[PDB]
Design a binder for this molecule. Sequence first.
Ligand SMILES: COc1ccc(C[C@@H](C)NC[C@H](O)c2ccc(O)c(NC=O)c2)cc1
Length: 375
Amino acid sequence: DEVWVVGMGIVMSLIVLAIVFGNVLVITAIAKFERLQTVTNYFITSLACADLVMGLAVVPFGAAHILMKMWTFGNFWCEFWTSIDVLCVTASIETLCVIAVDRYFAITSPFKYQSLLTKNKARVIILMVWIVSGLTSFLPIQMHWYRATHQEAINCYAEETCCDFFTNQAYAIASSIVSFYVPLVIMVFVYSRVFQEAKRQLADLEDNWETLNDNLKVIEKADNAAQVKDALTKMRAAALDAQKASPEMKDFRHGFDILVGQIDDALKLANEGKVKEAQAAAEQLKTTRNAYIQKYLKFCLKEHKALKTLGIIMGTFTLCWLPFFIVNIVHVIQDNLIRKEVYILLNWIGYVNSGFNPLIYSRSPDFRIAFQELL
Ligand SMILES: COc1ccc(C[C@@H](C)NC[C@H](O)c2ccc(O)c(NC=O)c2)cc1
């Protein structure tokens, strides 16, 4: 029947269109607009470039191998399509793990990360990633280093109208390890460490502010100057500790600078012996802390939003690529337990992650405001 053709042609066309549109949207406004040229954006644009080339190359030409019968482009073009597929997949996963490592270095030891790498270092990392993926993909294919030991694969290597993908045990295992498993382990450990540090930051911040509120409350009904002085000393210590623990961080530190200044004025007034003026400055401190939790409601919201992030990134990447890289190994060993159509389906579930990546890595306020003017 014609159901197999028309039912699944439209979804493939829509997938290609979504992939190309998202990738050209992400690539644009990174190099054009200011405030969007950062070291992390250098990895993001490489990921977008890999997704774009994969969406133009292997999705349309690969779908051509589907629906209709066989290959009508050429054996050299078959090798080129296979090589570019492996290159794009490997480059995308390596770029994902590089972005993970970038976030880890940003969160862990932020002072060193403030200036340790520049555009030159990020570009060097990008070229290293891309050349590693190319060595993994192009080199073992176009001169037939994967080969096979099957009688229904020899009738395809020396026959034009066929583009199956039969590889040796060593090549399949090495490609799975380089492309997916090493990045999987690296990014799992990286994002687990990033999760813990973020939890601990929000935790210390919320503690500090509890003792700030308690000290302010005890000042509100304090009797003598000694109680006000002691409570203001504890408030100053906790405020400095919270200050010690992006323009958002700049505003955060500026607000804590204002709070520390007001606390210092209150403490000096209390030290001089004027309890009433100390209580008035404490009322001003109450105004400041009330002004705080409008901003922290927003920022605690953004933080639990990127904590869901860990979930969204990990779940999407794993659910998209892990089934394919498990079936790939369990297919080269005990080959008769694996069916071809489910192999193609699991590979296309990996393919469709190309259109998902822009919708996972562009959910920032700067990217959101930049995307509007292009539309
Ligand atoms: C019906 O037979 C076929 C024919 C072609 C394919 C697409 C394949 C070239 N894409 C391979 C996939 O895209 C990929 C990506 C990254 C990798 O590291 C490896 N490794 C394989 O050993 C494989 C699939 C099944």
